């Protein structure tokens, strides 16, 4: 479970060209999740 700053995941928008990054990264959603 990779952590990046205040996130418990690695945003895919900063992986650039690292293939190992794209295998574990997650995308910031288009909408703020509810409860």
């Amino acid at each position: 479970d990779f952590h990046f700053e205040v996130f418990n995941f690695v945003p895919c928008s900063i992986c650039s060209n690292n293939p190992t990054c794209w295998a574990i990264c997650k995308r910031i959603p288009n909408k703020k999740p509810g409860k």
């Epitope: 928008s13 910031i28 959603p29 909408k31 509810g34």
Partner: antibody, heavy 122, light 109 residues
Framework: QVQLVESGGGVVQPGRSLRLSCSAS????????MHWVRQAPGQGLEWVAI????????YYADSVKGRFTISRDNSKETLYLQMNSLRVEDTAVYYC???????????????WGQGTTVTVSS | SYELTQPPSVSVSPGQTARVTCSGD??????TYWYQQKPGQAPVLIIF???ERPSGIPERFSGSSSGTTVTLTISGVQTEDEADYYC???????????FGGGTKLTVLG
């Protein structure tokens, strides 16, 4: 250190325009949503606008809809607020704040700047 | 349109327990957040996602929820806790952010 510095405030007449800037440093600016929040003298906080990390989603308060435009430049880690058709009731201190949207250890408007003062008067 | 209801003022003595409530029609589906603002300073995050306290915030601050009403609780209040406290959430569509009217917490020190 994580830091947000607002600038561009000043005194303007009603109907004029003003452009605020918010320069970030110390964190990956390009993965956070960014807010504008204002506070009139002696009054409470009022949400103004938000922009998504990639600049897509932009939402505004009804009190500023059609007059204010929010934008960001991730290459310079700067947030902007274009304020047109300014009114007397727009007089406030204007803060910028980051928002992870899906934060884990911190969430919401977890980092605020010190604000910049905008005064609209004839 | 969508508004959060927050008491304008609460008074407390040091050592007592201060409580600040905040209600909203969509709070059962939308997370709520709490900010502290001292005179002349920027707001500071105290509680996020109803109940979570960030590291660096004293343990005496806590938050809870009963549905459409959330509560900020400060046990053993200190004189340094005197400030304005704002609740904040989103509307039912999750595309508009709203602040409560703010609660001035007076600590009789």
């Amino acid at each position: 250190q994580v830091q947000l510095v607002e600038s561009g405030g000043g005194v303007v007449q009603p109907g004029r325009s003003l452009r605020l800037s918010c320069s970030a440093s110390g964190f990956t600016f390009s993965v956070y949503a960014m807010h504008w929040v204002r506070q009139a003298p002696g009054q409470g906080l009022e949400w103004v606008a938000i922009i998504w990390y990639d600049g897509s989603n932009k939402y505004y308060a009804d009190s500023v809809k059609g007059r204010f435009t929010i934008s960001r430049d991730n290459s310079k880690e700067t947030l902007y607020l274009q304020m047109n058709s300014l009114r007397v009731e727009d007089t406030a201190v204007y803060y910028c704040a980051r928002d992870p949207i899906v934060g884990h250890t911190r969430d919401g408007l977890d980092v605020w700047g010190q604000g910049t003062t905008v005064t609209v008067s004839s | 349109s969508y508004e959060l209801t927050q008491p304008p003022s609460v008074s407390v003595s040091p050592g007592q327990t201060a409580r600040v409530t905040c209600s909203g029609d969509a709070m059962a589906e939308q997370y709520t957040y709490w900010y502290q603002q001292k005179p002349g300073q920027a707001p500071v995050l105290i509680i996020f996602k109803d109940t979570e306290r960030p590291s660096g915030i004293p343990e005496r601050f806590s938050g809870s929820s009963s549905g459409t009403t959330v509560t900020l609780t400060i046990s053993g209040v200190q004189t340094e806790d005197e400030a304005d406290y704002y609740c904040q959430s989103t509307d039912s569509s999750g595309t508009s952010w709203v602040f409560g009217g703010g609660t001035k917490l007076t600590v009789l020190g």
